[PDB]
Amino acid sequence: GERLEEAGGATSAQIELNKKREAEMSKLRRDLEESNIQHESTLANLRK
Amino acid sequence: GERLEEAGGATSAQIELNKKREAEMSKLRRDLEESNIQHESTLANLRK
Numbered sequence: 001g002e003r004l005e006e007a008g009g010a011t012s013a014q015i016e017l018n019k020k021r022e023a024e025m026s027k028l029r030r031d032l033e034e035s036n037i038q039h040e041s042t043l044a045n046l047r048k
Numbered sequence: 049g050e051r052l053e054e055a056g057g058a059t060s061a062q063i064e065l066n067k068k069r070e071a072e073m074s075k076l077r078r079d080l081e082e083s084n085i086q087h088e089s090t091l092a093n094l095r096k
Contacts, residue, residue: 008055010059011055014059018066025076028076028077028080039083039087042091043090046094046095
């Protein structure tokens with residue numbers, strides 16, 4: 001009975017972190033755009 | 049006793065998935081710098 005709770009814990013435990021890691025992927029996906037759209041501004045700035 | 053192997057079959061499936069998931073997570077994490085050092089060099093090469 002404890003063995004279900006720990007292994008069913010183990011299906012619950014790792015499923016939170018990779019889901020949280022999936023939030024980390026979508027975090028850096030914004031930074032790649034942020035390192036583009038902010039970065040394209042200075043090239044538009046420095047040509048002026 | 050039926051729940052024991054499916055909780056084992058879930059973890060043996062899911063922990064199989066994360067070792068390539070951390071790789072593609074590492075890929076975008078290893079992507080931001082060669083946008084950064086690229087966009088710094090085009091700040092550099094356009095400067096002189």
